[PDB]
Write a protein that binds this DNA or RNA. Sequence first.
RNA 1: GGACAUGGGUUAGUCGAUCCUAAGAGAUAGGGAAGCUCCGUAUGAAAGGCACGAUUUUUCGUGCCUAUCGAAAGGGAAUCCGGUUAAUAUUCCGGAACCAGAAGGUGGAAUCAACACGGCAACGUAAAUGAAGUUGGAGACGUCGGCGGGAGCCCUGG
RNA 2: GAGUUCAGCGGCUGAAUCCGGUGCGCUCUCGACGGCCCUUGAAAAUCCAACGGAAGUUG
RNA 3: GUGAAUUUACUUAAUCAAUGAAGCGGAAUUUCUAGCGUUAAAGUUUCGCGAACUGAUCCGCGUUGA
Lengths: 30, 52, 120, 134, 354, 69
Amino acid sequence: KNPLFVSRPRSFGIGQDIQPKRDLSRFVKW
Amino acid sequence: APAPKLPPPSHEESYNPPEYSNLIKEKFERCLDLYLAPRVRRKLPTPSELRP
Amino acid sequence: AKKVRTSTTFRRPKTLQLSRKPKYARKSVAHAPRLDEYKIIVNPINSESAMKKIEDDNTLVFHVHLKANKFTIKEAVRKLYSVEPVKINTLIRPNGTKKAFVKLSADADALDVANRIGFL
Amino acid sequence: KILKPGKVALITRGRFAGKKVVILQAIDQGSKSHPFGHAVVAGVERYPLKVTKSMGAKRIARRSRVKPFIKVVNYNHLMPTRYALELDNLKGLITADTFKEPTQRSAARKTVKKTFEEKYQSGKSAWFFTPLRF
Amino acid sequence: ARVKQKGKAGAARIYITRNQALKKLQLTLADFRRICILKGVYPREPKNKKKANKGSTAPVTFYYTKDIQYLLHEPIVQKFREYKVFARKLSKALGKGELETAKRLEARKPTYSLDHIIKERYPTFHDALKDIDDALSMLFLFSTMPVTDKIGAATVANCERLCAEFQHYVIRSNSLRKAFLSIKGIYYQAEIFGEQITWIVPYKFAQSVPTDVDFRIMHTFLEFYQALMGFVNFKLYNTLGLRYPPKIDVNTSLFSNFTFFLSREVPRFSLEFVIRAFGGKVGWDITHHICDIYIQPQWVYDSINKGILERTDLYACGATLPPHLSPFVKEEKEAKELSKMMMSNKQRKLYSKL
Amino acid sequence: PRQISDIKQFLEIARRKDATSARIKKNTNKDVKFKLRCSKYLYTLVVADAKKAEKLRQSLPPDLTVTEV
RNA sequence: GGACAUGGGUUAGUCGAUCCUAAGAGAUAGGGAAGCUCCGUAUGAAAGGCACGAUUUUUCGUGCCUAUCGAAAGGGAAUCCGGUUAAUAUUCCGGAACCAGAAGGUGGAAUCAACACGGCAACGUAAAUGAAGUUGGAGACGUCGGCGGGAGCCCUGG
RNA sequence: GAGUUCAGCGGCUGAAUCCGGUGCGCUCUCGACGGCCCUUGAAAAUCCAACGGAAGUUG
RNA sequence: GUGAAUUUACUUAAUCAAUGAAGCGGAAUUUCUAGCGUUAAAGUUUCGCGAACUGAUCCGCGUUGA
């Protein structure tokens, strides 16, 4: 429970933090 | 092929010196070191008489 | 287990590329070194300007092969006359032949070396 | 009177630009050596790195180390800030005599370093120890 | 010429990282480690790691590109590819229910010889003798552990044969010199062709698998060591002109006039070796009745290290035990404060350790 | 070329193995120039004093090749 | 005699070409065409890499992201003086430098307060670790007009 | 010490190669500006920097 | 070409527009400023930047739009 850790959450809304790596298998140029 | 620098021998630890389940682990560590550890082969100013 | 694609691109996978293991060598016999020192050094130059460079600049002047470069001329001179050059200059003459100025060291006497070659 | 001993501020000019400092003592009247509204501050030169649930105590301690600095700074080069940082260990240790005496300057710098160690470890003034991204 | 670009020659040319070596050799990490076990290939760090990493600073293990270039022409790599083909053919036969061809494939399973690897690694048989202690330690360690899924029974049998032939060679040649008892086990010290060999043999006990070590590391080491000892013992038996492999089931006269008898409370496996290692006569289930005149086991060992028989009263059953000694164990102010401006020349590191 | 303003620097560079030869140049204004040919630079020391000139010249190592104007 | 004959003569790490790209040429993927060939230049291409791992069921897993040719006036690493031949010189000779690349060595500098200090500041100091990634700058820019500085020249008093 | 100029000698020896001015001058260049455009006046190779913080008594 | 009662609809054939073929269809349920945003982390569960699972829903999967 070291207080140094802190949360630092990321918000992935439009215009917010960079989108996380998602599955793009249905958009791949096969 | 430079020598693997053989581990030091027994350090005089015995039944009762006035100075084993892990044996497989040290032997495995030695085998790891044989291919993971890199191998390296290796005036008088005389202040007495000038005593100011 | 469906593989996750995070690039929206499909890039050609890397497959094993075996090296060549021929059943036979295409050439039976390897050719000899096509440019050895006897072909590299054709003749020395004994013209009056060539003599002047010999007797003052400690420089030997040779007719050399077209394919010979400065490195090969130095090795050829070192192996053919046992004297190591300190400097080499080359020019293609208007007659199409290459000529090399070979400045010897102070350790060597260009006059003496010219005498051993025999053209002096 | 927004610049008081114990107020957090930002430095915008000099080598330590963009660093967060605590006003150790204000010389708003000025001085013969510094004919302006200067104030001595203690700041964080190298901010501690972020830590995680993982990593051993060795790595956590290695990343939690903090390098301070002490500097006389003009008011026009300081940017005041609402957050305030106070501790009795850092009250009155600094003065003009400390700056002239270089051993006292190093001693005050080490005392500021240590004080920032307990403060960071205790988890106080997390904003002050977070670097500002500009 | 034009400007040469940095990182094209020198350390950045003669050193190669592990991953680029993988791509250079077109090998997996496991297979690359395998040939590095078989051959002599170990990391070698550059004096300027940053420069040899083409300016990068990330920690990297470095190999000589010359070593990796040599591994390009190793026939064992082709044998690894052949086995991968064999495994898929066998798996295909099992998947299609072709049991007969699976048996045919198992009969024709491709294996590789380490004769060239041994010859290149140890050009002189003296060098092979020098680098044999690790092989002995591994073989004697695995000869006692139980056979499990990872360890092959045929491999254990080969370790038993190689260890038995070596032990009998030491017995015939009286090559054993010292034997020390540590908490780890028994350290034997022998001498052959001037070279000294030390190896540890653990007690015969009911151990358990640690479930932490990788036996594939030991499998390649065992296979390499088994090949080495097979060749070394073959040379030794040819040198003294006796049949190899032998069909035997298992101060030259220090114990010549002693008919020792073994009871069911002592390590016979080690006692038989050490006593017959000096030519003593051994019988198993009478001058001395060993049981822990009545003497203690350390009496015999202190006798052989001293070269003469010890004193019984010291090591009588239930008496005191002297500390078991390992034979392996073998102006000032101005002088100390003269460190003028020298920086790197200051070598007080030696004075601080030694 | 490099100018050296220190005599002991001139001796130290002369002691260094890269030194090849030395020239003593006597000018019309009774000022001497001690020049030292190294691998990379011609190190020159301008000595305007006569007595410092010849004590330096005898201070130069005997193995070094010292040459007249 | 630039004619005829006979010989001789052009020496480069630094000057250019080579390197880069320009307009433009031009393969490849593809599609046309009976064909010679045409179109097309990241396009309807599976167009290649880099890093981590006690070795992973000793049958490799886990991650992360465009050719070429085309400028001796464009862009661009770094050489000067004196001398020398019948004819060559920033090329040879003497003397004096410079650039790029490479390895380790010596001396110093930082570091157990890991990755230097000073200056209010503009910023300075002989040093003063910085991967992937991203971003910025330089390269890199019209034409005209006067003004001011320097260099050479011209002029000028002894 | 070079180069130049002069005085001797039979390659060598003596000297000198000094101290200043000036400008709507000429050529080149640099600096800081002004004007002009429904015209705003290349790319790339190369090179450097920053942000970031991976790694890390001896070393 | 496929349907629904000349009348409507559908898209897989072909046509057109965009791109690095990123968030299409279902269900569950970021605006006072010329700044920086990467190299996850807290949470949970096994065993230090080793893991896993979510953080960052599931399903269909026809790259989207005409």
